[PDB]
Amino acid sequence: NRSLIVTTILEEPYVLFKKSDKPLYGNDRFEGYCIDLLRELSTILGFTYEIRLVEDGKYGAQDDVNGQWNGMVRELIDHKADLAVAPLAITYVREKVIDFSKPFMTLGISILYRKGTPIDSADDLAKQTKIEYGAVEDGATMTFFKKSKISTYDKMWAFMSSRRQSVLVKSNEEGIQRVLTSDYAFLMESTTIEFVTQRNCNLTQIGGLIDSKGYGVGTPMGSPYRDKITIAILQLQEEGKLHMMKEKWWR
Amino acid sequence: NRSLIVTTILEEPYVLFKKSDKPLYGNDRFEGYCIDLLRELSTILGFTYEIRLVEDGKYGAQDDVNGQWNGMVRELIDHKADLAVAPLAITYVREKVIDFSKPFMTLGISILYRKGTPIDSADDLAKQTKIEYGAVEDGATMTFFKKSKISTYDKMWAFMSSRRQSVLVKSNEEGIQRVLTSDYAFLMESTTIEFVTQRNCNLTQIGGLIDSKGYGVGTPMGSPYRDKITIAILQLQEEGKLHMMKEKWWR
Amino acid sequence: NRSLIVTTILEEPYVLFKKSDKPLYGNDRFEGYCIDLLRELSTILGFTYEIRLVEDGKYGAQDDVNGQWNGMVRELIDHKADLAVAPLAITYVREKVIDFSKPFMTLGISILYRKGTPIDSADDLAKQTKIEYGAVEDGATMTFFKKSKISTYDKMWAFMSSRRQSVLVKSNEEGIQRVLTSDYAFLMESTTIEFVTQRNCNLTQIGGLIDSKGYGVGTPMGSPYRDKITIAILQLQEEGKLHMMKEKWWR
Amino acid sequence: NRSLIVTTILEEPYVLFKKSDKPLYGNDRFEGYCIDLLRELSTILGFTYEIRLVEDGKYGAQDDVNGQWNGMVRELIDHKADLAVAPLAITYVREKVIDFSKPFMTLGISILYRKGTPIDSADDLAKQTKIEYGAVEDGATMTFFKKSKISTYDKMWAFMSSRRQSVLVKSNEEGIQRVLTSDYAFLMESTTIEFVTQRNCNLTQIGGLIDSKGYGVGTPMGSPYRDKITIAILQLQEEGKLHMMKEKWWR
Ligand SMILES: C[C@H](C[C@H](N)C(=O)[O-])C(=O)O
Ligand SMILES: C[C@H](C[C@H](N)C(=O)[O-])C(=O)O
Ligand SMILES: C[C@H](C[C@H](N)C(=O)[O-])C(=O)O
Ligand SMILES: C[C@H](C[C@H](N)C(=O)[O-])C(=O)O
Numbered sequence A, B, C, D: 001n002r003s004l005i006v007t008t009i010l011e012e013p014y015v016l017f018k019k020s021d022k023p024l025y026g027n028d029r030f031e032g033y034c035i036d037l038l039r040e041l042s043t044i045l046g047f048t049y050e051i052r053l054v055e056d057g058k059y060g061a062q063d064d065v066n067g068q069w070n071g072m073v074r075e076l077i078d079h080k081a082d083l084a085v086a087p088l089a090i091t092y093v094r095e096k097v098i099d100f101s102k103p104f105m106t107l108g109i110s111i112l113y114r115k116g117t118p119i120d121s122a123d124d125l126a127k128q129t130k131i132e133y134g135a136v137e138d139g140a141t142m143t144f145f146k147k148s149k150i151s152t153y154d155k156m157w158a159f160m161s162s163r164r165q166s167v168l169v170k171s172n173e174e175g176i177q178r179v180l181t182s183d184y185a186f187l188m189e190s191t192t193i194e195f196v197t198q199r200n201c202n203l204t205q206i207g208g209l210i211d212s213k214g215y216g217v218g219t220p221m222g223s224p225y226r227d228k229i230t231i232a233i234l235q236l237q238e239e240g241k242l243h244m245m246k247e248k249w250w251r
Helices: A033-045 A071-077 A122-126 A140-147 A151-162 A172-181 A190-197 A225-238 A241-250 B033-045 B071-077 B122-126 B140-147 B151-162 B172-181 B190-197 B225-238 B241-250 C033-045 C071-077 C122-126 C140-147 C151-162 C172-181 C190-197 C225-238 C241-250 D033-045 D071-077 D122-126 D140-147 D151-162 D172-181 D190-197 D225-238 D241-250
Strands: A004-008 A049-053 A098-100 A105-107 A109-114 A132-134 A184-189 A203-206 A213-215 A218-220 B004-008 B049-053 B098-100 B105-107 B109-114 B132-134 B184-189 B203-206 B213-215 B218-220 C004-008 C049-053 C098-100 C105-107 C109-114 C132-134 C184-189 C203-206 C213-215 C218-220 D004-008 D049-053 D098-100 D105-107 D109-114 D132-134 D184-189 D203-206 D213-215 D218-220
Touching (some): A071 A098, A122 A151, A172 A184, B033 B225, B071 B098, B109 B190, B122 B151, C004 C033, C033 C241, C122 C151, C140 C151, C140 C184, C172 C184, C190 C203, C218 C225, D004 D071, D033 D241, D071 D098, D071 D218, D109 D172, D122 D151, D122 D203, D140 D184, D172 D190
Parallel strands (some): A004 A049, A132 A184, C004 C049
Antiparallel strands (some): A105 A213, B109 B203, C098 C218, D105 D213
């Protein structure tokens, strides 16, 4: 009955360093929606744990050359963690190498941009090359465009790909600052856009959702914990706890 | 220089009868998001108008037999109205018979149901036959399921169709009541679900968005007003007026 | 420049018949806080007037069956009076049919009862059915309970409603005597409770204020006099005249 | 059979240092409404006690960061006192961490200001930014505004918060002086306003009560003294002793 190693990633308001005038220890060092979720999972299912930040700082994507995965997905594959509790998108390509619990939140890719412009959709971005746009490198949004067969999205990936180092960023925070400082549109997940626009009155979502997906807890393929976590999540959902947590962290 | 005839439909909070102690006349008899939109359109483009409620009380669907359309769509086809300003979904099948302005709002089909249940997605509904589910008859949501080739949605339509008279309702309002008084789940548009859940704390959206679409102003095919209205809408969007209108009527 | 018809209602110490060994005429026939107020309004704004007692002897409520109003509210609606100067509560439902000046006095609903009992709140009354309680029929207090969604108040209305003819009275004076003669608690406005308890040492207020409201001068909707009266009232308030009038009539 | 430690706070006329030429000892060093109440409680329930002044000088509020409470509330939580007998407001947020006896007095938040001004309500204050307004830091009134969802009160808090160090004071006394020496309106409890206006003829309450609440004796959660104290208070209330105590200290 050893403590489980839970990998996650810094992402407001799901996971962040808790601030305090005095020293913090162990799990108390972190806070956020996913941290509250993890706590609930541990008491419902009866396990102890330790929080680890994904070492390469990535969510997870497959390398073009060697086909190897990185990020949290890879840490689960290599059994460097028992669980991945973070805003981790459940995707078909990931389901091939790791397992996911049922979703604890639903969302979709959308566009973050400055308000007061004539850009009103992805098509408005794809039809021009002046305004640059991108996404978080090695994340689910990037992979969506990289694998899309939809004309507009295919051309958008061709654009991003050709300017990979200039338009792909290392985090949502970096993408947001890019939007606030230059003529740049950012492809990010709707749930995070909701949080951002609520705090940056000069920003807004552009258009609707480009796709639909959900966040789930990740486990190494075959892990006996996956089905147990799904039971816990469904219980939290039904009792309205997940709704309560969303309200608390989004305000 | 005659006034334009604008067809619409009662649907809170887009269009409703304005309440007052003193007799109301003309366009002042109605109010709502779409009524405010119509007003802005008239002063920006320079036209006067009169509001008409779609005679058959339907949004618009194609008949299986004669293949003819009904509702607002049909009123436009037969030139019984110059414009249709309402929460009218822009869809491929409709675009074949009428024209649409660019969208003034984005949304997607989703599920409305009571809180505290184990139903967490459409799949949860489709895999069972105990709790019934449906949509508004002759609307875009019903048509979506009727034309879908996605397994889950395909069997969901088989279900609805076989119990058409018992599960398909005449309005969102009827559906909401059906949900509050019986084991029934309702397929409706996210923007309306948003309005409903904020006023019915026992209800909640189930899962995420099943599709993505937008509302646009409808015009008879070939109408010279379509492109002009698109220009007006984009201006209202860019200046933040559409966002202001949404906040005013949803709150 | 005809004299205005001012409707009011007998209610100590706002309005009462002035006593005198010799015959009294015109406006000299009445006295009280509201009569002093009316006089001030007439000289500040420059108008003459005649005092009329509301014919049906009611303050004003909407009928359940036909939705018609009665009391002073109805006399204003039917233009049977230019102004209503009395302890008339400014309420949302009334604002729909008549206009009110800014408040000239603030108050709240409370409970009048005998002292020396274990009843200490509305909850103490609502949890039992032995001690009866009520309010003035067709007044603002009755309407407050009739429209309240607050559990305790909802159950209290269910009680009063089921015993309407036995517990609802025609006036505060009738309610007070009911309290002095039988095991009965009376829901009345705090300002009047203040006057009563000061003269009936055996009575007392129970609990705090159940709501907050104010008294205002009523006028038919759209009356040009409403804003003028507000100016007069605010001036009287600022100079301390309203405070002086309260002290004079409450002692 | 040890004496109980009772925490309280200096606040006229509930608690103050008794003045005398000869040295005073023990409980005789204090006096006031709450000191008389405490005395009656001790003889009715059969306990001895010692009075302690809350060390941090605060009533009690929850910290935004660590979420910890301070003031008398915190002294009770940490069992640094057996009882808190003072004008301690019974509130929902406090009831989550400590217990309260039934109320021994009812009141509501209101506005204290100079007479002869055009300010007649909270709205009059909230619609302007010239004259400043505030409340006692870390008290129930401040918390009310900080948690309110009522538009007017919401913007009033935005105002106070943005000028926290300049408008939030350490005591009612500081607030009263702030009102007598500058263009400042003070949000304080009605029962205290009542005491102040009777001794400061230039001051007056503005508008009516903004909310309704009561003062109760606080105890650590689960304390066996809570229900016993409620019984004592209800007895004092029924016999008219609480009314007598109010008259004695307010006059
Ligand atoms: C940053 C985010 C990561 C995304 N939640 C994932 O799981 O890879 C994105 O791709 O937009
Ligand atoms: C009621 C609604 C109608 C839909 N807005 C339309 O344009 O047909 C629906 O189909 O869900
Ligand atoms: C008697 C009184 C009337 C109340 N002042 C009104 O305006 O209807 C009450 O309802 O308590
Ligand atoms: C000073 C007073 C404290 C208040 N009686 C309390 O219990 O926190 C206030 O908040 O207005």
